[PDB]
Design a protein around this nucleic acid. Sequence first.
RNA 1: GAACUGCAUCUGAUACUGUUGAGCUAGAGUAUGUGAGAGGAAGGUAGAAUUCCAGGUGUAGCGGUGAAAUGCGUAGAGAUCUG
Length: 114
Amino acid sequence: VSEGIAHIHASFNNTIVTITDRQGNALAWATSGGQGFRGSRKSTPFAAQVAAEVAGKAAQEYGVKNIDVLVKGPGPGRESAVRALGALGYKVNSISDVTPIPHNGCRAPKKRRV
RNA sequence: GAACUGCAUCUGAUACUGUUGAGCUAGAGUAUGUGAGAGGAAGGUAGAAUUCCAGGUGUAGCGGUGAAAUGCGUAGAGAUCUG
């Protein structure tokens, strides 16, 4: 659909990249746990790279060329995913970081005593 | 003989303590002007976020860990958009 939004929900464990249209209707999506990487490999920038390639090329059937990416989360694969999307024929309009930050809202879980 | 550091009663002194008369302002307070503050109490309200409920897109994973598994998901999750 020519114009689309990439959503890179990067996290410490897994990174999920989904391309939707302007009104937030998903076209294609690919994660790192569904690409052959499990456990330690899933939390790697390369896994996010291949997830971004799979999702972006699978959404290119719909005809999207101009994409604006929206990164969210602290995960390792939040720059490699954008690089994979950009170096795949996509035209990046903007790169915006939209990860949610509470203004001292809900209480966080207790500290891990490892 | 000395001592018995004691008690009593008179006499004397007034530096200090006690009791009193008067005065003073330096300790302590009062009135008046400005100022800072997450000081307190009662109401109201805002925006981010989480969770849940209901829908649209969509499809095979999500989540989690040192690795896993329990758990959630094809009864459609997770992701994304809107209420």
